[PDB]
């Protein structure tokens, strides 16, 4: 499948390529409904 592992610094554009959406609130789930 894959040869050698490469490691490098994390560019901000590369981090935005990893992601799937900005987190903006510190709340996690609700506990009244367990849906997040």
């Amino acid at each position: 499948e894959f040869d050698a592992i490469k490691i490098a610094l994390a560019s901000p554009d590369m981090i935005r390529s990893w992601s799937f959406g900005e987190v903006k609130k510190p709340e996690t789930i609700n506990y009244r409904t367990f849906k997040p």
Binding site: E27, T28, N30
Partner: peptide
Amino acid sequence: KYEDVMHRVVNHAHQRNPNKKWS
């Protein structure tokens, strides 16, 4: 209507000496 679970989080290391590390 929030009962945010981060106010229910168990302090699961409640017996550790405060000077120990890595946890």
